[PDB]
Amino acid sequence: MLKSVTESFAGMIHGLKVNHLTDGIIRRSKRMILDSLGVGFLGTGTEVFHKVTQYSKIYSSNTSSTVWGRPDFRLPPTYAAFVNGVAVHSMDFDDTWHPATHPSGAVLPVLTALSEALPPKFSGLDLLLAFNVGIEVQGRLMHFSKKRFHPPSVVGTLGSAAAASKFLGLSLTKCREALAIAVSHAGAPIANAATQTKPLHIGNAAKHGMEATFLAMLGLQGNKQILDLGSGFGAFYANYSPEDLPSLDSHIWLLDQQDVAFKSFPAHLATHWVADAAAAVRKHLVTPERALFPADHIERIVLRIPDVQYVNRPFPDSEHEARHSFQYVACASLLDGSITVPSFHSQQVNRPQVRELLKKVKLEHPPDNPPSFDTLYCEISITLKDGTTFTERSDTFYGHWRKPLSQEDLRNKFRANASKMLCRDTVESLITVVEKLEDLEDCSVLTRLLK
Amino acid sequence: KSVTESFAGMIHGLKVNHLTDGIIRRSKRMILDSLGVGFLGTGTEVFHKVTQYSKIYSSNTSSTVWGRPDFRLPPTYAAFVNGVAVHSMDFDDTWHPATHPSGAVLPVLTALSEALPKFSGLDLLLAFNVGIEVQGRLMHFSKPKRFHPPSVVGTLGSAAAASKFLGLSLTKCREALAIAVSHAGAPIANAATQTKPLHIGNAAKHGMEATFLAMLGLQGNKQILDLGSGFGAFYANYSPEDLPSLDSHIWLLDQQDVAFKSFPAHLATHWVADAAAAVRKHLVTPERALFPADHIERIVLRIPDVQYVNRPFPDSEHEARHSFQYVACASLLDGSITVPSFHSQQVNRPQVRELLKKVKLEHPPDNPPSFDTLYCEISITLKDGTTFTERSDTFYGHWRKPLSQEDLRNKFRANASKMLCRDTVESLITVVEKLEDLEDCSVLTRLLKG
């Protein structure tokens, strides 16, 4: 090895310049940014967001950065990134990568908060760089396994520090300390990822990553081998296998070889397969002449699906539980003919006709279906009361990186998510600003529109 | 299933009724000692760095910053920088199983009292002892360590402490613990660096943050403490256990006192310094008062293999703090080991470096790395062959030979020496020594600023 894994990361963060950007990234990185803002503004209406903003009200006295959807209220950059990151992840509506993590929410709120609170204009190319440095570090730390911690709390916290560290031009040595100090703020046990605290893992990753960067600039030191030791960053890994990063001339961003998956409805990405296969099998059982789902004719529905038992909730009674329910996403798809934001509202999840369809669903876990967003599939077999059986299988859903979302489709998702919180003018301007970020001379024109 | 609820039930159920004069006594010593090394901790470079950062929240003036009336912070970040001060010099409490429990609990409560009827010194004492009890119980759930214990249990100690002090619902005390879990757990590698004090500062802050969020209705996992995918993820072998009935409950602090340090360094070196002083008395006289370093052949220190304290040649103040070798020789040369002994200019003395080169370590098979059992033997062989041997199984300060009150007060008086005038110092001893009878915690918090 040329040097330690830890220094390899400090070198790449400090070294990567604007010229290192690849066209494919500026493209996919712009899709992620508008998506995360859209789901973020939609998240500003959730109870989780209302709770973290109320707490954050004790630091209001510092009015440096914007709080999305709350122009009556400003916060220091650390807690602006905290609550905005929470809103991004508040509904499980944000982007999803491979290996599995949600990397945009932990990075973007940091850079927008930094640009506002900071005084030397900053380029849109500068923002895209720091953002893609945050995305890159998360993906490469992700491959260090060869279960216990929620990856967003782990890789996101460092991804956050990396993004902030390049955005503010820290010395090579100081980007190293920012990574090390962030490691002490990282690692939330994954049991809490199954509760309404899950959004805070992303908000803390953004916040703590920034905090670590501030302390790095003030001279605080961490372990100079934090990424190389099992007693360091590897403590979060069942089995740790770190690897130094390639030279910059031989550097291929992981975002170039692996796009992100974008969600069409706010729920666990595993259910997007269930939704796709449900929409297909549904059109066998309804006609223009018999337009309501023939639930009475049904006897048994089975969802062939990997054993991600976090998503195995056959009788959800809350908005949060239905978001991670193989069963409900299918039943609501079969009955409503669609599955969108309002499908998860309490009023809809406890519909009597939904309850009765949930009684007929059993989960099958075929051995050829591993729990990986890059491999898994959903097969749905519906057996009528008379005996007839219908089966439909979905290997890919519209939104997955194999079948990525259109640009207009992703633009109309954003317009629907920003609908309640911003007027038409602001919505369309943000689209134009984001769609051509590289050409921007001053990040301020974007930050302005966020309020 | 039950373990998480039992914790929430005890936190919520423990009343002033259940406080025993044993823990009230041992608690007031921890409160004074930690206040002491906090005030002294305000002179550390690490404390200056966290304060410089925490000034972005300066706008909120709800809680005091020790040693700096210059500015005030919101309680979350007052407890943060004050906790950092308490562990900034490795001078604070040490319990068994090994952790530093006061630093994660005391800055929490003092900040809360300041930032918001009355709170009696006994309300504070109860909140404090709950925070300490919770830490000890979670420490007893393990059967290669990767996480620094203060950042794991200390964070929950802070949450439980603040949850009691603010009278949280039973269900909310549970959520405050569950939220705190997502804020806990620092890899132990950073415990060997300048960042370690922040583990205690974040334990205090995060525990308070988790308490504030639970108060607003936020919820975590209902069985975070029962699961290996929950709080167990920080343990190599997690074995949780329900907590006893409050009728059958015995405070862990009633059967296990804390060790109090006499000099700012890893507690393991206190055995070495104890033995180093007992052998020194053979090689110096009133007529020959200086240590005859040139007449020594080698210095054998029989000591548990705590490789973090194995630093034969420290060149810094932070490294000498965890050096079997330096503490030993500094005791042999100066005939003492105190706060100034670790200053950079003392560590890099030429004679210190020449004595260090005569030191060799031995790891006896009967010397396990446990503060409750380990010992230090020291054998000095002169150049003429004569060998002097002395052994320290317990040192003055250990829980087996605790510090007297007056010694603990004089340690406090010496630590607050620089930040407070003597009158405030003596006042602080008065108030704390009689905190049970205190009517309002404001009397205590005022004196913490000058």
CSV table of N, CA and C in Angstrom, one decimal, chain B residues 10-79:
chain,number,residue,atom,x,y,z
B,10,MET,N,-37.8,1.7,36.9
B,10,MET,CA,-36.9,2.1,38.1
B,10,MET,C,-36.6,3.6,38.0
B,11,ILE,N,-36.2,4.1,36.8
B,11,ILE,CA,-36.0,5.5,36.6
B,11,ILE,C,-37.2,6.3,37.1
B,12,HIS,N,-38.3,6.0,36.6
B,12,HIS,CA,-39.6,6.7,36.9
B,12,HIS,C,-40.0,6.5,38.4
B,13,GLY,N,-39.7,5.3,38.9
B,13,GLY,CA,-40.2,5.0,40.3
B,13,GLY,C,-39.3,5.4,41.4
B,14,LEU,N,-38.0,5.5,41.2
B,14,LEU,CA,-37.1,5.9,42.3
B,14,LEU,C,-37.5,7.3,42.8
B,15,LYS,N,-37.8,7.3,44.1
B,15,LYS,CA,-38.1,8.6,44.8
B,15,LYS,C,-37.0,8.9,45.8
B,16,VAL,N,-37.0,10.1,46.3
B,16,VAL,CA,-36.1,10.5,47.4
B,16,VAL,C,-36.1,9.5,48.5
B,17,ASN,N,-37.3,8.8,48.7
B,17,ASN,CA,-37.4,7.8,49.7
B,17,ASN,C,-36.2,6.8,49.7
B,18,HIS,N,-35.9,6.4,48.5
B,18,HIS,CA,-35.0,5.2,48.3
B,18,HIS,C,-33.5,5.6,48.4
B,19,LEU,N,-33.2,6.9,48.6
B,19,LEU,CA,-31.8,7.3,48.7
B,19,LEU,C,-31.3,6.9,50.1
B,20,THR,N,-30.1,6.3,50.1
B,20,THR,CA,-29.5,5.9,51.4
B,20,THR,C,-28.3,6.8,51.7
B,21,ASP,N,-28.1,7.0,53.0
B,21,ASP,CA,-27.0,7.9,53.4
B,21,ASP,C,-25.6,7.4,52.9
B,22,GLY,N,-25.5,6.1,52.6
B,22,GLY,CA,-24.3,5.6,52.0
B,22,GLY,C,-24.0,6.2,50.6
B,23,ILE,N,-25.0,6.2,49.7
B,23,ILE,CA,-24.8,6.7,48.4
B,23,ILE,C,-24.8,8.2,48.4
B,24,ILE,N,-25.6,8.8,49.3
B,24,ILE,CA,-25.5,10.3,49.5
B,24,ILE,C,-24.1,10.7,49.9
B,25,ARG,N,-23.5,9.9,50.7
B,25,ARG,CA,-22.1,10.2,51.1
B,25,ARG,C,-21.1,10.0,50.0
B,26,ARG,N,-21.2,8.9,49.3
B,26,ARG,CA,-20.3,8.6,48.2
B,26,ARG,C,-20.6,9.5,47.0
B,27,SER,N,-21.9,9.9,46.9
B,27,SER,CA,-22.2,10.7,45.8
B,27,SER,C,-21.6,12.1,45.9
B,28,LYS,N,-21.7,12.7,47.1
B,28,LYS,CA,-21.2,14.1,47.3
B,28,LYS,C,-19.7,14.2,47.1
B,29,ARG,N,-19.0,13.1,47.3
B,29,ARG,CA,-17.6,13.1,47.0
B,29,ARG,C,-17.4,13.1,45.5
B,30,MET,N,-18.2,12.3,44.8
B,30,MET,CA,-18.1,12.4,43.3
B,30,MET,C,-18.4,13.7,42.7
B,31,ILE,N,-19.4,14.4,43.3
B,31,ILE,CA,-19.9,15.7,42.9
B,31,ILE,C,-18.7,16.7,43.1
B,32,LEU,N,-18.1,16.7,44.2
B,32,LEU,CA,-17.0,17.6,44.5
B,32,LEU,C,-15.8,17.4,43.7
B,33,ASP,N,-15.4,16.1,43.6
B,33,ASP,CA,-14.2,15.8,42.8
B,33,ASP,C,-14.4,16.2,41.4
B,34,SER,N,-15.5,15.9,40.8
B,34,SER,CA,-15.7,16.2,39.4
B,34,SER,C,-15.8,17.7,39.1
B,35,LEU,N,-16.5,18.4,40.0
B,35,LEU,CA,-16.5,19.9,39.9
B,35,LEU,C,-15.0,20.4,39.9
B,36,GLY,N,-14.2,19.8,40.8
B,36,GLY,CA,-12.8,20.2,40.9
B,36,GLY,C,-12.0,20.1,39.6
B,37,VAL,N,-12.0,18.9,39.1
B,37,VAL,CA,-11.2,18.6,37.9
B,37,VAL,C,-11.9,19.2,36.6
B,38,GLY,N,-13.1,19.6,36.8
B,38,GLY,CA,-13.8,20.4,35.7
B,38,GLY,C,-13.2,21.8,35.7
B,39,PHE,N,-13.2,22.5,36.8
B,39,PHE,CA,-12.6,23.8,36.9
B,39,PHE,C,-11.2,23.9,36.4
B,40,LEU,N,-10.4,22.9,36.8
B,40,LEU,CA,-9.0,22.8,36.3
B,40,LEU,C,-9.0,22.4,34.8
B,41,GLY,N,-10.0,21.6,34.4
B,41,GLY,CA,-10.1,21.2,33.0
B,41,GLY,C,-10.4,22.3,32.0
B,42,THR,N,-10.9,23.5,32.6
B,42,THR,CA,-11.2,24.6,31.7
B,42,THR,C,-9.9,25.3,31.2
B,43,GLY,N,-8.7,24.9,31.6
B,43,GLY,CA,-7.5,25.4,31.1
B,43,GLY,C,-6.8,24.5,30.0
B,44,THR,N,-7.5,23.4,29.6
B,44,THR,CA,-7.0,22.5,28.6
B,44,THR,C,-7.2,23.1,27.2
B,45,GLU,N,-6.3,22.7,26.3
B,45,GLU,CA,-6.4,23.1,24.9
B,45,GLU,C,-7.7,22.5,24.3
B,46,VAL,N,-8.1,21.2,24.8
B,46,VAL,CA,-9.3,20.6,24.2
B,46,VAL,C,-10.5,21.4,24.7
B,47,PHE,N,-10.5,21.9,25.9
B,47,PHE,CA,-11.6,22.7,26.4
B,47,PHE,C,-11.7,24.0,25.6
B,48,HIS,N,-10.6,24.7,25.3
B,48,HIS,CA,-10.6,25.9,24.5
B,48,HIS,C,-11.2,25.6,23.1
B,49,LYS,N,-11.0,24.4,22.6
B,49,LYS,CA,-11.4,24.1,21.2
B,49,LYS,C,-12.9,23.9,21.2
B,50,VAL,N,-13.5,23.2,22.2
B,50,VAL,CA,-14.9,22.9,22.2
B,50,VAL,C,-15.7,24.2,22.5
B,51,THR,N,-15.1,25.1,23.4
B,51,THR,CA,-15.7,26.3,23.7
B,51,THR,C,-15.7,27.3,22.5
B,52,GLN,N,-14.6,27.3,21.8
B,52,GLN,CA,-14.6,28.2,20.6
B,52,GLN,C,-15.6,27.7,19.6
B,53,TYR,N,-15.9,26.4,19.5
B,53,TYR,CA,-16.9,26.0,18.6
B,53,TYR,C,-18.3,26.3,19.2
B,54,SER,N,-18.5,25.9,20.4
B,54,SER,CA,-19.8,26.1,21.1
B,54,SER,C,-20.3,27.5,21.1
B,55,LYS,N,-19.4,28.5,20.8
B,55,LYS,CA,-19.8,29.9,20.8
B,55,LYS,C,-20.8,30.2,19.7
B,56,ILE,N,-21.0,29.4,18.7
B,56,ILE,CA,-22.0,29.6,17.7
B,56,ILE,C,-23.4,29.6,18.3
B,57,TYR,N,-23.6,28.8,19.4
B,57,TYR,CA,-24.8,28.8,20.2
B,57,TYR,C,-24.8,29.8,21.3
B,58,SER,N,-23.7,30.7,21.4
B,58,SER,CA,-23.6,31.7,22.4
B,58,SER,C,-24.9,32.5,22.6
B,59,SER,N,-25.7,32.6,21.5
B,59,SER,CA,-26.8,33.5,21.5
B,59,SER,C,-27.8,33.1,22.6
B,60,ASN,N,-27.9,31.8,22.9
B,60,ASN,CA,-28.8,31.4,24.0
B,60,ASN,C,-28.0,31.4,25.3
B,61,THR,N,-28.5,32.1,26.3
B,61,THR,CA,-27.7,32.4,27.5
B,61,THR,C,-28.3,31.7,28.7
B,62,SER,N,-28.7,30.4,28.5
B,62,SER,CA,-29.5,29.7,29.6
B,62,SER,C,-28.6,29.0,30.6
B,63,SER,N,-27.4,28.6,30.3
B,63,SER,CA,-26.6,27.8,31.1
B,63,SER,C,-25.1,28.3,31.2
B,64,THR,N,-24.5,28.1,32.3
B,64,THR,CA,-23.2,28.7,32.6
B,64,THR,C,-22.1,27.8,32.0
B,65,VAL,N,-21.0,28.4,31.6
B,65,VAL,CA,-19.8,27.7,31.2
B,65,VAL,C,-18.7,27.9,32.3
B,66,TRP,N,-18.3,26.8,32.9
B,66,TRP,CA,-17.4,26.8,34.0
B,66,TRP,C,-16.1,27.5,33.6
B,67,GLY,N,-15.5,28.3,34.6
B,67,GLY,CA,-14.3,29.0,34.4
B,67,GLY,C,-14.3,30.1,33.3
B,68,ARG,N,-15.5,30.3,32.7
B,68,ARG,CA,-15.7,31.4,31.7
B,68,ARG,C,-17.0,32.0,31.9
B,69,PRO,N,-17.1,33.1,32.8
B,69,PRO,CA,-18.3,34.0,32.7
B,69,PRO,C,-18.3,34.8,31.4
B,70,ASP,N,-17.3,34.6,30.5
B,70,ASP,CA,-17.3,35.4,29.3
B,70,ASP,C,-18.6,35.2,28.5
B,71,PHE,N,-19.2,34.0,28.5
B,71,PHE,CA,-20.4,33.7,27.7
B,71,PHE,C,-21.1,32.5,28.3
B,72,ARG,N,-22.4,32.4,27.9
B,72,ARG,CA,-23.2,31.3,28.4
B,72,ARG,C,-23.8,30.6,27.1
B,73,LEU,N,-24.2,29.4,27.4
B,73,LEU,CA,-24.7,28.5,26.3
B,73,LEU,C,-26.0,27.9,26.7
B,74,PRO,N,-26.7,27.4,25.7
B,74,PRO,CA,-27.9,26.6,26.0
B,74,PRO,C,-27.5,25.3,26.8
B,75,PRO,N,-28.4,24.7,27.6
B,75,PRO,CA,-27.9,23.6,28.5
B,75,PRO,C,-27.2,22.5,27.8
B,76,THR,N,-27.7,22.1,26.6
B,76,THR,CA,-27.1,21.0,25.9
B,76,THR,C,-25.6,21.1,25.7
B,77,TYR,N,-25.2,22.3,25.3
B,77,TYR,CA,-23.8,22.6,24.9
B,77,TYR,C,-23.0,23.1,26.1
B,78,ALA,N,-23.7,23.5,27.2
B,78,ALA,CA,-23.0,23.8,28.5
B,78,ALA,C,-22.5,22.4,29.1
B,79,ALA,N,-23.4,21.5,29.1
B,79,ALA,CA,-23.1,20.1,29.6
B,79,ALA,C,-22.0,19.5,28.7
